[PDB]
Amino acid sequence: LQRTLVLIKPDAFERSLVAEIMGRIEKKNFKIVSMKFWSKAPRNLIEQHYKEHSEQSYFNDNCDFMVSGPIISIVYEGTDAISKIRRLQGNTNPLASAPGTIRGDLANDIRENLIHASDSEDSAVDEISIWFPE
Amino acid sequence: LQRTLVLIKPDAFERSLVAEIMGRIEKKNFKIVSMKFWSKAPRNLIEQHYKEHSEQSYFNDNCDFMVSGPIISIVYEGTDAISKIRRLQGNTNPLASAPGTIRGDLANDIRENLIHASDSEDSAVDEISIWFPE
Ligand SMILES: Nc1nc2c(ncn2[C@@H]2O[C@H](COP(=O)(O)OP(=O)(O)O)[C@@H](O)[C@H]2O)c(=O)[nH]1
Ligand SMILES: Nc1nc2c(ncn2[C@@H]2O[C@H](COP(=O)(O)OP(=O)(O)O)[C@@H](O)[C@H]2O)c(=O)[nH]1
Ligand SMILES: [Mg+2]
Ligand SMILES: [Mg+2]
């Protein structure tokens, strides 16, 4: 059993895709362990979440996008949940994300890509503690 | 603009219909304003939520059901949200709920009926204050 951190991004809200995204994960039989709705996440939180990208040219624009609307943070639990949810999510790059994946079916941009999911056990622990410090 | 309180009930988690239900409200263009996941709601909030029914024969069994699994409490905002979401919800009695409604399509029991929605302006204020004391 593993736990992974998922963010539903502001573009899901703008486009009314929140349920569509959550439903894909729900249909694969992952269970919600914690969940938090943010009318607007604090920029500091976003900066921490993306600390590993701080030197990338897109860092600030991505932070702006991530505070541009609401977010839902969710901790999902299930056997190999981290890798499995990453496969459902689909690749970041719109030239690569596979039809059948969340990004492959629904996302058309490298930034506005609807959903974050932890990429490893090490980052899951980190991200979960950022969004759910308790 | 109005705000209404919705509970996603434990039978929705059991039957994996959480997204399906939230999705119907999202497609109607209502906006999440607050949201909290409860792994198990405290008995006292449930009894206060249903205080109107405290002397009814079904009170204890209903309360028991409502703590039998997780729930999500959500505040939705929109023009005439209270009456419109109630219309989406459908009649408590499965002999009466209309196809096209949440309960008409999905519920088959007077108690395990998937969703709560505030029935009036006054009850919405009260229920919001219970679940989001803030
Ligand atoms: N390569 C790239 N990444 C971007 C850009 N703009 C924003 N990002 C964001 O940086 C976030 C974190 O990147 P990464 O860990 O590689 O992607 P993810 O795990 O698939 O979300 C991604 O979700 C992108 O939204 C861009 O212009 N180029
Ligand atoms: N067994 C039983 N349970 C009931 C009955 N009426 C209401 N309940 C339960 O009490 C909850 C609140 O009832 P009510 O406000 O009338 O219905 P609602 O607004 O449609 O949820 C319902 O969701 C049912 O679980 C009934 O006639 N029999
Ligand atoms: Mg990443
Ligand atoms: Mg009622």
Side-chain angles (χ1 to χ4, degrees):
Chain A
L1 234 48
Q2 264 182 353
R3 296 174 167 182
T4 189
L5 178 290
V6 158
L7 304 178
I8 307 309
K9 299 181 171 181
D11 58 330
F13 288 88
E14 167 66 33
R15 290 177 65 208
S16 307
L17 293 175
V18 178
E20 167 72 30
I21 298 157
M22 286 177 73
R24 292 166 176 239
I25 300 181
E26 186 172 13
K27 280 165 190 200
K28 177 111 187 135
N29 215 26
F30 293 105
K31 304 301 177 199
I32 297 161
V33 159
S34 318
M35 187 161 48
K36 229 274 205 179
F37 171 86
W38 304 77
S39 57
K40 178 172 74 271
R43 189 181 284 268
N44 192 263
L45 222 57
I46 297 304
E47 294 180 344
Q48 286 317 289
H49 183 86
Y50 289 114
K51 61 181 163 285
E52 291 293 284
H53 303 262
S54 63
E55 305 325 301
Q56 304 308 299
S57 85
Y58 54 78
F59 180 76
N60 204 255
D61 286 348
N62 189 51
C63 288
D64 289 346
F65 159 67
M66 288 294 283
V67 294
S68 76
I71 281 177
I72 291 168
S73 46
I74 311 169
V75 176
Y76 281 107
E77 179 176 79
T79 299
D80 294 298
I82 298 163
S83 70
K84 286 168 175 171
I85 291 180
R86 286 283 278 176
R87 293 185 69 236
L88 293 177
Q89 171 189 220
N91 193 260
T92 329
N93 162 38
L95 300 172
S97 63
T101 66
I102 294 161
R103 291 162 167 183
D105 291 346
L106 308 170
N108 208 14
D109 184 77
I110 192 132
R111 175 175 304 125
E112 306 187 1
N113 57 36
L114 303 165
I115 172 168
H116 167 88
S118 312
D119 65 12
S120 72
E121 272 190 308
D122 276 69
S123 53
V125 173
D126 231 330
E127 296 170 4
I128 285 163
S129 74
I130 290 181
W131 294 91
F132 299 96
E134 334 81 22
Chain B
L1 250 38
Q2 266 182 348
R3 297 183 168 197
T4 191
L5 182 285
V6 159
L7 309 171
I8 308 304
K9 295 190 170 172
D11 57 333
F13 287 86
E14 176 63 25
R15 297 172 62 205
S16 297
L17 291 170
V18 174
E20 167 68 34
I21 291 161
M22 293 184 63
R24 288 168 179 237
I25 301 169
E26 186 172 15
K27 282 169 172 175
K28 182 63 159 180
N29 211 212
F30 292 106
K31 302 303 185 212
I32 303 163
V33 150
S34 312
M35 176 167 41
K36 188 181 185 318
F37 171 81
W38 305 79
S39 48
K40 184 183 185 173
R43 178 87 173 205
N44 62 330
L45 296 186
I46 292 311
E47 295 194 356
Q48 161 123 289
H49 181 83
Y50 286 116
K51 85 169 80 85
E52 190 193 19
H53 307 260
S54 62
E55 310 309 311
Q56 300 298 305
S57 56
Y58 52 78
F59 187 70
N60 289 337
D61 286 344
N62 189 52
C63 282
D64 280 349
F65 163 63
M66 290 288 290
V67 301
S68 71
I71 63 166
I72 300 164
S73 61
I74 310 171
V75 174
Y76 280 112
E77 177 173 81
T79 184
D80 288 301
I82 297 165
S83 72
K84 294 167 177 181
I85 288 166
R86 281 282 275 180
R87 220 283 158 66
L88 254 19
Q89 168 184 227
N91 196 289
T92 328
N93 195 320
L95 293 169
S97 53
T101 68
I102 294 160
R103 289 162 164 179
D105 287 342
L106 308 178
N108 198 35
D109 187 73
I110 192 155
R111 165 179 307 124
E112 310 190 348
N113 60 35
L114 297 169
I115 173 166
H116 172 86
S118 305
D119 67 2
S120 68
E121 313 186 299
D122 293 333
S123 57
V125 174
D126 288 352
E127 297 173 0
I128 287 171
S129 83
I130 288 166
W131 296 97
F132 298 90
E134 93 218 78

